[PDB]
């Protein structure tokens, strides 16, 4: 669940 | 009352207080006014946002917020409860208030809630209280805004925080619509551009988004961020944002390289750009930062010019670097002629490789050791590859008088780069 | 007495005093005895070795040397002047002696002169005084030995320091004869094996080298060194060195990862070895390491995760079982993608679960209480997770109906050499 | 040079  | 400076908003090892102090000092030296504390992996900012700072953490935060005010830099404290908060549960909201209060008493006046990079749904409990995801964030954000007594500067980072991230499009998003509508006018909205790392920020994009946001946004600028790629460093000028944006924005905060000392250019050229329209030439600001940076480091301005050109921008190499790439490509494409031209270019090329070697040896012999260290792995990498590229050009030239293949015998491990990760990369098309 | 421990001897950011101290705690706890200070890019160690320590630096070193004595770890100070020293010049020699004495009074008793990675010929002023390059290092080393009163431990790292570095071979190298014979019988010689990063150090090679240098060598082991590639980390067991090497060597000092916290396996397993199964020793080391990872305390990471982590960043010549396995599976799926008889998809499913475990491993590591460890390994673990998740999706792309700048410039040039993937 |  990160930058993209 | 326009906000311009740095957000520490990346993944990875955060900066230490001695870096953050040296940072403030530089910001004022260059007339920037703002700092957003939002390091993704300082666990009490995001991972364990519910938790209070311990005694020694308190002393440290206070000392830092001191230095901020001592240097007239506005300190904004961020908190990222997005991951696991229950919006409808009031004990949750209490925990968030108790946390922000604890920071209030450090000397902190400005605050930010960030909801970037989180799941787009909610839990069964929330689906009842709130008609949408958008409602839930807004409701809690406002509640806090007022609880803080409507503070000086207060930022909100939405989940759909850039063009790519708006569903199904930017100007037809239920989520962004309801934010525009319901988020209180004194709360500012954060935006990264049309992408997470924007190559260009068109004024039309800002206009289009301002109409849905019902206000001007502060840019979270990922122009110089290098946390998403181990090999990547960005020493290029601030670029692809018109000076004509300044009147149309509430601020720009740059999220820069993880390695503190690499951000000299990144921050300087942003300063120059802001101070030019409180056009602007990327090529020219770069010239300005490199000269003034050269003071801090033996090493020549040309070595810096090379270095910036090798690690320039997420979508662009620098002149001297793009040049070497073309030249190597031609040389490898037209190798099969081994006739007059080819060799002179190879000789010239092996020379440009020399300049990289020289840039490395002088940088290692330099007196500023902090700066060396932040960059050491990055420049050793390019030196290594350039020397293998010099070597390979040499070998191609020697083809007419030898049939030995390029690697001879048994290899040391750095003949074969990247480890497992590199192996999986070579298998993608 | 046999020397075993760590040398801080890599290029790049050296460890800070507080890390070294922690190293001393770990070496003692694991029953090791030695630390060789040789960080190539510490300022005063090599580039500007002539310069004396300030008052503040002085305070910092002796504090560190005291700690060494406090933990019964033998502290060896090394100095690398070979770069631009002139041998014949007395001012240079006094500068060397004076540098040494300054560290004596810091509480030091053991020393090293290192001449690795320097040009083979000298300045004209040295060309006549000494007949050969070898003769010339030997002379200055011996003199320094006696100058400090022939101390208990004194180490010399030769220029031809590994099998591959010897001209035209080890067993018949001019340079090595001169070291063997002219270097004082009580000084020790450092050796990395057949190569700079030795996959194996076979017994026969040690005999071949000891004959020609007339003594048993101290191994400077680069098995776990990771300074030479941004993308590379080595958390695998000490491997490729038979226990039968022990009778034949004065010591082993390992030159381990740049990122301090990553060297738990690398050092624990060397210890284990010193007291042998590489996989048994990994299991003991991973098991003890797990305890260093906690959840943080709250008023409002598993062993299989560590096993996975180590398999992915294992050793220079070898991937770990799980890593190789996922790489096999990914190969077969990409090859047999044409199918989309039955089997492939049953196997695509298991593979996305493996990818899952990589993402899982990163998530848990991200919540751990020991931030020192996280930070040290962050970019390494981040990378693997990104690539895996991309590999996961790409595998799906084949099942479904539906970064050109990755690595930047370096990446781009690298993709143009034919030797890229010459090892897959 | 370097270890090379
Ligand atoms: C998304 O990506 C950037 C660059 O990788 C990271 O630093 C940032 O924390 C994330 N969030 C936002 C709002 O950009
Ligand atoms: C040679 O290379 C290793 C790994 O790249 C480096 O750490 C070490 O300083 C150099 N010298 C010796 C004797 O290994």
Numbering used by the authors:
A (entry chain D), D (entry chain B): 393 to 396
B (entry chain C): 59 to 336, 373 to 391, 552 to 592, 604 to 694
C (entry chain A): 59 to 333, 374 to 398, 553 to 592, 604 to 665, 679 to 700
Give the text the authors published on this PDB structure.
OGA is the unique enzyme responsible for O-GlcNAc hydrolysis from a large number of cytoplasmic and nuclear proteins. Recently, our group and others have independently identified crystallizable constructs of OGA that comprise the catalytic domain and stalk domain, and published the apo form structures and enzyme complexes with active site inhibitors. These reports consistently showed that OGA formed an unusual arm-in-arm homodimer, where the catalytic domain of one monomer covered by the stalk domain of the sister monomer to create a potential substrate-binding cleft. Exploiting our previously reported construct of OGAcryst (residues 60–704 with the unstructured insert residues 401–552 replaced by a glycine–serine (GS) linker), we solved the structures of a mutant OGAcryst-D175N (catalytically impaired but retaining the ability to bind substrate) in apo form and in complex with each of four synthetic glycopeptides.
In the substrate complexes, all the glycopeptides were bound in the OGA substrate-binding cleft. Particularly, the GlcNAc moieties were anchored by the same set of OGA residues in the catalytic pocket, displaying nearly identical binding conformations regardless of the glycosylated residues or the flanking peptide sequences. Consistent with the O-GlcNAc hydrolysis mechanism, the catalytic residue D174 was optimally positioned to make a hydrogen bond with the N-acetyl group of GlcNAc in all the complexed structures. The N175 mutant side chain played an important role in anchoring the glycosylated hydroxyl of serine or threonine and stabilizing the OGA substrate complexes. Intriguingly, the peptide backbone of TAB1 also adopted a V shape, but it was stabilized by an intra-molecular hydrogen bond instead of the interactions with N175. However, the peptide residues of TAB1 oriented dramatically differently in human OGA from those in the bacterial homologs, suggesting that human OGA dimer employs a unique substrate-binding mode. If the peptide bears intra-molecular interactions, it would provide additional stabilization energy for maintaining its ordered binding conformation.
